[PDB]
From a paper:
To investigate their distinct catalytic mechanisms, we solved the crystal structure of PRPS2 in complex with R5P, ApCpp (an inactive analog of ATP), and Cd2+ ion (an inactive analog of Mg2+) by co-crystallization. However, the Loop2 region in the catalytic pocket of PRPS2 flipped ~90° compared to that of PRPS1 due to the insertion of 3AA. This conformational alteration ultimately reduced the overall size of the PRPS2 catalytic pocket for substrate access (148 Å3 vs 302 Å3 for that of PRPS2 or PRPS1, respectively) and introduced steric clashes with the C-terminal α12’ helix, leading to its structural disorder in the complex (the prime indicates residues or secondary structures from monomers other than monomer A). Surprisingly, PRPS2 exhibited ~15-fold lower kinetic efficiency (kcat/Km) in R5P or ATP compared to PRPS1. Strikingly, in vitro feedback inhibition assays indicated that the enzymatic activity of PRPS1 was inhibited by GDP with an IC50 value of 706 µM, while that of PRPS2 was unaffected by up to 10 mM GDP, suggesting that PRPS2 was insensitive to feedback inhibition. Indeed, PRPS2 binds with GDP with extremely weak affinity (Kd > 200 µM), whereas PRPS1 bound GDP with a Kd value of 10 µM. In contrast, 3AA in PRPS2 sterically blocked GDP binding at the allosteric site, abolishing the feedback inhibition response of PRPS2. The observations also indicated that the four non-conserved residues of PRPS2 (3AA and Q156’) enable its enzymatic function by bypassing the conventional downstream products allosteric feedback inhibition. PRPS2 utilizes four non-conserved key residues to bypass the typical ADP/GDP allosteric feedback inhibition, enabling sustained excess production of newly synthesized ATP.
Phosphoribosyl pyrophosphate synthetase (PRPS) stands as the first and rate-limiting enzyme in the purine biosynthesis pathway. It catalyzes the pyrophosphorylation of D-ribose-5-phosphate (R5P), obtained from the glucose pentose phosphate pathway (PPP), at the 1’ hydroxyl group position, yielding the catalytic product 5-phosphoribosyl-ɑ-1-pyrophosphate (PRPP). PRPP serves as an essential metabolic intermediate for purine biosynthesis via both de novo and salvage pathways, as well as for the synthesis of pyrimidines, amino acids (tryptophan and histidine), and co-factors (NAD+ and NADP+). Conversely, PRPS2 displays ~94% identity with PRPS1 and shares exactly the same biochemical reaction.
Residue numbers in the entry:
A (entry chain C): 1 to 99, 102 to 197, 208 to 213, 216 to 308
B (entry chain B): 1 to 97, 102 to 198, 207 to 308
C (entry chain A): 1 to 309
D (entry chain F): 1 to 308
E (entry chain E): 1 to 197, 207 to 308
F (entry chain D): 1 to 197, 208 to 308
Amino acid sequence: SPNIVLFSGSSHQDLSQRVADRLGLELGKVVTKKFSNQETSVEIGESVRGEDVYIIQSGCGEINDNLMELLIMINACKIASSSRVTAVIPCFPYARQDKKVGESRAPISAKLVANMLSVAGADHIITMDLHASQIQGFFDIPVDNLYAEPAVLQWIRENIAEWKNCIIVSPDAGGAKRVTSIADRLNVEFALIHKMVLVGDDRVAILVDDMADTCGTICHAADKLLSAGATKVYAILTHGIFSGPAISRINNAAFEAVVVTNTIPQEDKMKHCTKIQVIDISMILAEAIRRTHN
Amino acid sequence: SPNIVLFSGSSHQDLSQRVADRLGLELGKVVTKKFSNQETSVEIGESVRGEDVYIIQSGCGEINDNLMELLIMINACKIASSSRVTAVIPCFPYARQKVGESRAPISAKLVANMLSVAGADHIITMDLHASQIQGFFDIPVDNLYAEPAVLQWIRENIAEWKNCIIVSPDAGGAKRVTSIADRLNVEFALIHKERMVLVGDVKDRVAILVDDMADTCGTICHAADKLLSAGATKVYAILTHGIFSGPAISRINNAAFEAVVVTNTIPQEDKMKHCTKIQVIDISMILAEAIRRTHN
Amino acid sequence: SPNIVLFSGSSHQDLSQRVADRLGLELGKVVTKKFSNQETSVEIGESVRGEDVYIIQSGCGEINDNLMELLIMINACKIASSSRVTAVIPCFPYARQDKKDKVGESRAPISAKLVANMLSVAGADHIITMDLHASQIQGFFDIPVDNLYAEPAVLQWIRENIAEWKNCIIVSPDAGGAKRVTSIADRLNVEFALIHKERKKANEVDRMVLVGDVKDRVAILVDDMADTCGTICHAADKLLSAGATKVYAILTHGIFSGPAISRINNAAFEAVVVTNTIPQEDKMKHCTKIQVIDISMILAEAIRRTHNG
Amino acid sequence: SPNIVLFSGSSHQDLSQRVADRLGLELGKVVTKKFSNQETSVEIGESVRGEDVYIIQSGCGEINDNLMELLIMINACKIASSSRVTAVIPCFPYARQDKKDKVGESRAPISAKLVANMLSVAGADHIITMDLHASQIQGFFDIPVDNLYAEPAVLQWIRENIAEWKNCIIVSPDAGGAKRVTSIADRLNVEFALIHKERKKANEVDRMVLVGDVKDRVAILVDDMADTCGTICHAADKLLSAGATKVYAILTHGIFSGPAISRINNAAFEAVVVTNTIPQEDKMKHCTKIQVIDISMILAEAIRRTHN
Amino acid sequence: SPNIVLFSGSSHQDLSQRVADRLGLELGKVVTKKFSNQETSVEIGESVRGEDVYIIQSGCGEINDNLMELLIMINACKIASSSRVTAVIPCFPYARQDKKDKVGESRAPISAKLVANMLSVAGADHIITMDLHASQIQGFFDIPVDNLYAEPAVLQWIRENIAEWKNCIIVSPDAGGAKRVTSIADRLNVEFALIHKRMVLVGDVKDRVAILVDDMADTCGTICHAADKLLSAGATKVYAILTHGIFSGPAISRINNAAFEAVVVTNTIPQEDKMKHCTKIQVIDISMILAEAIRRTHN
Amino acid sequence: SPNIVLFSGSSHQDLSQRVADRLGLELGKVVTKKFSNQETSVEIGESVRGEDVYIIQSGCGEINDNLMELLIMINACKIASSSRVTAVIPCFPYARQDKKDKVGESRAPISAKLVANMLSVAGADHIITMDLHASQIQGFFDIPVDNLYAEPAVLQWIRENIAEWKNCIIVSPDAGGAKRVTSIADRLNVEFALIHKMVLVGDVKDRVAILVDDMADTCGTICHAADKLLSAGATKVYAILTHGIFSGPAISRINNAAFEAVVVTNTIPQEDKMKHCTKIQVIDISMILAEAIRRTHN
Ligand SMILES: Nc1ncnc2c1ncn2[C@@H]1O[C@H](COP(=O)(O)CP(=O)(O)OP(=O)(O)O)[C@@H](O)[C@H]1O
Ligand SMILES: Nc1ncnc2c1ncn2[C@@H]1O[C@H](COP(=O)(O)CP(=O)(O)OP(=O)(O)O)[C@@H](O)[C@H]1O
Ligand SMILES: Nc1ncnc2c1ncn2[C@@H]1O[C@H](COP(=O)(O)CP(=O)(O)OP(=O)(O)O)[C@@H](O)[C@H]1O
Ligand SMILES: Nc1ncnc2c1ncn2[C@@H]1O[C@H](COP(=O)(O)CP(=O)(O)OP(=O)(O)O)[C@@H](O)[C@H]1O
Ligand SMILES: Nc1ncnc2c1ncn2[C@@H]1O[C@H](COP(=O)(O)CP(=O)(O)OP(=O)(O)O)[C@@H](O)[C@H]1O
Ligand SMILES: O=P(O)(O)OC[C@H]1O[C@H](O)[C@H](O)[C@@H]1O
Ligand SMILES: O=P(O)(O)OC[C@H]1O[C@H](O)[C@H](O)[C@@H]1O
Ligand SMILES: O=P(O)(O)OC[C@H]1O[C@H](O)[C@H](O)[C@@H]1O
Ligand SMILES: O=P(O)(O)OC[C@H]1O[C@H](O)[C@H](O)[C@@H]1O
Ligand SMILES: O=P(O)(O)OC[C@H]1O[C@H](O)[C@H](O)[C@@H]1O
Ligand SMILES: O=P(O)(O)OC[C@H]1O[C@H](O)[C@H](O)[C@@H]1O
């Protein structure tokens, strides 16, 4: 008797209708405006009572507005007596830490967002490649942390002639688990960069990290990879935020291409950068939603 | 040995300092900045262990930015082992809101829960749009009133106050407007939009529209025009929270007001630059007393 | 396939059956009783497993006995593994507050919020109610609360029972009832008026001021409830001395406690009309002015709606 | 540091001021009435901010008005920013259960647990009560619960008031109070016995069984409370037909509902002794057999102990 | 439409399968082990989405590993989006309190309620258990708790195995099993007696078969001395019937040397290895009771 | 003013009294035993009312028992009306995982979050722990959690114990300790390399190699790692860990491994294992915990 109701806010209209087309359904009717004083207004237009409802919004643009907007729609479908409300958040906001010498720091912002999603009334969360997977434990809720790697792997094979050889390098220490894993799915060798010194060593170098925001490191990392004798250097990321200086710096850096997936709207930045190519994840999320709905 | 601690956000720094002056202390060092990707950042610069923390943040300007900042700073003081954390919210956001049934305040309630989930232990605000918002929490809430200062201003700035009339621009501020009447021994009038109709007698008397907030300001401008059509000598507009967004200031500039009075729960210095008819009432003392009281 | 079970408390049985009659079902077997030491006893007599339970009980009578009786059968249907328990509370208890000037600030609504938390902790999953004293009480919960209006019923009673309703005036007994009266006024496309008692001071006389004109019109005072009924009786007196042909009083909740019935028998009203969120039969037997408006359609349709669309 | 402000609800004012007298304090300014429509009103008259509040209300009279009155007063002192609120409930309401059989399972204590959850949600932080019908009720909370015993005062009354207490017999009126009597028995260095009324079957006659010997001995039945009192009256008669010189009854909680007074006026008790967890003043004016033990010192010290 | 899913833990494989058999099912695939560093590991082998899962685990053997295993498995099926997770706990752990009793008040059951809160936070939605040491433990949760009785099967065992049963006497080993003894006694229309500790006796056993009844039997001292006293009071025979037979250290050695006719327990706790050294122990099977309870809550 | 009260369990008697000495006080009276049926028993011997109590129990030994007893101790303290209860857990149990290679998604920390929720419901108000396998476990609570580092004491142990440390090389088995090796390395302005299965990237030829990671259990990875590190030229190989677990066949392995010393901290009882393995050396962290306890007590 519950049928899937699919919503979307203001954050990523394109991805949302893409998964709608993968599921065979239309987006639900909802009007999100902002009042003159900047208070977010969300009014549902469809009946969602007794339905399994999925609200898709990524933490990308004006996030605080997108996040507040998301919470308002979650609380709105919960007060409306829906059987279930699922937050589909491709890019989870506040996942990073801006961090000591003697102890760590509770991730107060990431756990604060978990608590607000929980109190708003969420009953399921679907997200992709979190900055730290242990954020699933910031919740007493099921959290699907889907990996984009198959997407990354197939894209390489399919797109890069030289993949069979090549080398995967991480721009940082913390990503090493990430390169390693991707490397051995290709039965391939690895190297890593640390702020600049490089470890490991005429191959197609491909830097892999979870997200790319200001992009400074990965550009200086590319400059060192070509100084270490690399044929080409690629940059493949899950979340492409490209804030500030980023696109200008990608405009002054020598990438064959920089690949990301569409957890974040990029078209308007594609128009300013010929490098960027985007992988479609409509089916992973689409498929994950359908799985959750049985 | 808790000591009072005053932290200010990005919303209303002048007001924060102003109550700090009233309490005789310094403000707590905190740097609030947004990251390149516009995520809010907060880094407290002092120790708050065993302290009575007070963060002064009004619901104004960039609302979701300001509230999210407030929540991050509250959490940061609770994970830091504060004795208590009190959110001072001069103008509470989202306070505002079918045949056959009523809607639920679902945003106000949502912010209540987000402040509670962040770790707030006490709330100090002023003039809630509905006093029952105190019940959206399970923690003490000191919904303060600006009337004392409004009656004082009225007596001391309107010559003919003994023979004025307090008018409510709507059908919901009635108990707010009779309150004033009873305290000035003056009558009130009520306006309804049905073409606006007025109930009451205004001919040859000074009319004073009073409400809690003014945002787009259309109802009070049209209300002034009718009150003058009913023969009112002068029109005042007295508001606790002066949001003044949109086309409002243009409207009061074209409006037949003698003056419009608001409180400093929201920054108004910028708006008076563009509007000579606005005047503000300091409520830094009201919040100051509420803090002192709550601190014991 | 979750089914639907209607339970009645003690407070208003008649309305429970009327909602049963409108839903096409009969009432679920439950025995409610007072022990010798006046301890509430609730034994439900039919299976509620996997069922959609609705318990109908109004905040009237011995308020605390009915409220505890309601909480116990909620927690009894909740421990017995029902799929959902909806508390249908036609008149919500503790909705008003005994404040009075607390100047410089307001007082927290401690009783209404405490009853909200007790309904929540008892195990309620949904709330239905009719005309809350303040709609923001919906926000005192974390579960869906439906506050229905009786306005449609008041408007149809008014059109079918008051001869010159076209030229009436809708009056509020107080400030704070202005929105309600205006609403009703615009709906009948008639105008409104307001009455404000000034607070007596040391050496005055009590006075009510009327803002608005009622001369030569049928006056209709409407508020959310009537309990002690002094304000509306003096309101009828003042409306008639302002030149009103008649005075009615139409409330959604008719509490009638203390001297109310004695006061209406001696007041100047044409009628005092209320809804059946509270049993009124034994009151009309002592007061011929009370008339009743049935609202079992609204509660019945809200129940049917809350079950399967 | 917080002081102690102590408040009395309507139910047992006399005992609250006895506890006040024991603590060297006076009761706090509070007005508790009823509105016309029977809603409870609680308005605190003094400041409780940063103080240690203790509210004494017993489970008696009109119980749901008193329980409601207790909860409203707790959440009123909690929202007023009290340092800590403690509910002193000498006789805890809804403690017993009307199960009166389950054959392959037991029933849940729905009412006692629900009252535990309402005290918790209202804002209670500590509970102090006396002789719970089941000690396990302490586990119905996530806050401390002090379930104090009246046994010292009962032993004291027995020694100073039963002439032949040295060879007295402690009797339990039921199977469940056995552990109770045992306790008392070994403390007086005397023996016990049990009364058990069997299920009346159709066509059988009312049959009560006595286990133990009470011949030529003073019998004293002992149970956590007394409410309608039928089982203990018949227990008296059975004990006397079994050759007991005298029968006493000592209960911690004297409810005395319904027909009890009349029952006891026609019962062959020498004395029915209870504690003052419930007002008894007006009952002794209709029953000369009722005698009260004061338990002010136990609650008084439990409070002083909780405050430090 | 959710189907019944039954899982079994380390504690009682036999009885688990045994209820699986009375239900017409097989257990679900679960693998359990303990890592080299002694940490409990659970890996469910089936999908439990949308399922009505039942986990059977008794408070026996090594209890903290069994209980923890139980909590990971509940807080494993619950996160896997099961329709509902039910803990089937035949013998509830930590149900008793170390009765070191302060003279003027009582002690709260801190361990039983602690076990209650950990089962609740793990994600349990229902609990099925048998003869709790105190029934009010049902009140340690805000979720439905089924406290099933073995007394039907005990009464039937008694009538069908003790020849002289119409004139026996139900006895209790202390002052807390009195209600229980009373209960079966009236069901059998038979008088009763109780022992309180010098050990004394209240009641008459002369020339009767005496049967000790209580919920659990552990180090067994009380029931052995109770047997000795009952025979000293002129009893023909002494039996001991309980629900949960824990039989910890010195117990087996104690009853082997005790004047018991037989000692009866249920299979809420595994015994067979205890029957290997003890010929007086006999087991009453209660798989039906749990089966009935599972099926009824599942509807 | 609340005094500070200290309790210890069965897990680490040695450590607990050391922090007691550093704080200038003695340990609290508590008898912990296990009933005949294996039911942990706790009985507090001293009044904790209105006091600030700290209970130290490590996820060492037989963990389920010590953790269950820890919970009993914390809840014994909460209903005894203690001013506050803080769980001092030097080595957090169930911190680790076995999720691995689910293709396309992670497995949630079901176990560590479960221990968090169990510590929270038991009544804990603060946690003091050291070197969590993942710092994000701090976020598994809503209460302050101090995840202290042992890195100061390891840096000073080396700087005073390895002669060839100005030019050393710091390394681990699989990358995952990278959020780690870097940190130790740059605090000495030193290069580094990492091992991943078996290959190694970086070069340590003719230099002292130093494996560092969080906890050692089985130890296979680090022994094979030590051997390969020689296969590439290091002068000597050391192994520096914080928690010294050494379960299963670890000690036989290290006795057969070519370490010049394997160094751990005393978050876990070591003495029994030092009598069987001469390569073990212990760094004492009682001061760090002492500072954290003292600092939260104000
Ligand atoms: N919104 C934000 N939140 C936290 N840090 C931010 C931030 N925006 C920018 N930063 C900056 O970006 C830096 C990137 O830090 P990272 O090393 O990516 C976090 P990490 O979790 O340690 O990654 P790793 O785990 O992959 O090392 C932050 O440390 C800070 O310097
Ligand atoms: N940020 C905001 N939140 C809610 N309403 C807003 C809003 N910004 C603009 N509005 C507009 O202002 C209207 C609400 O004004 P009111 O109806 O006076 C609030 P209310 O709570 O209904 O007042 P009451 O106290 O009179 O009921 C909205 O319906 C919409 O027309
Ligand atoms: N049960 C009750 N609760 C509160 N006040 C009661 C009462 N019974 C009688 N009263 C008295 O009658 C008065 C009626 O007050 P209400 O009108 O119910 C207050 P309100 O909730 O602020 O709403 P309003 O502003 O719409 O009038 C109370 O203030 C008090 O004088
Ligand atoms: N695992 C265990 N847990 C708790 N107590 C245990 C125990 N093993 C042995 N004991 C002891 O067994 C006794 C408790 O048994 P019981 O008295 O039957 C529980 P009770 O609730 O006090 O019983 P009662 O109803 O018979 O009075 C105490 O001496 C206690 O310390
Ligand atoms: N007691 C234990 N608990 C959990 N896993 C254990 C374990 N003992 C051994 N293991 C094994 O050791 C493996 C640990 O691998 P790790 O590399 O630590 C995964 P991680 O938690 O992501 O840490 P990393 O960041 O070091 O990768 C476990 O996944 C399992 O293979
Ligand atoms: O380069 P900046 O932003 O100035 O400094 C930090 C850089 O390092 C981070 O990983 C991003 O790549 C940033 O670009
Ligand atoms: O005329 P509008 O701008 O629509 O409304 C004017 C004011 O009245 C409205 O309720 C808002 O409060 C505005 O501030
Ligand atoms: O009724 P009285 O107490 O005389 O007046 C108080 C009025 O105010 C409330 O609105 C009641 O309904 C009462 O009418
Ligand atoms: O009230 P009664 O008819 O006596 O019998 C019920 C008895 O059961 C209880 O023990 C009460 O005290 C009552 O006596
Ligand atoms: O075993 P003992 O030390 O003699 O006494 C303890 C009694 O209580 C326990 O449940 C035992 O099994 C005994 O019956
Ligand atoms: O081969 P095992 O030791 O049994 O298991 C894998 C090893 O590798 C891991 O990092 C641990 O060190 C283990 O010891």
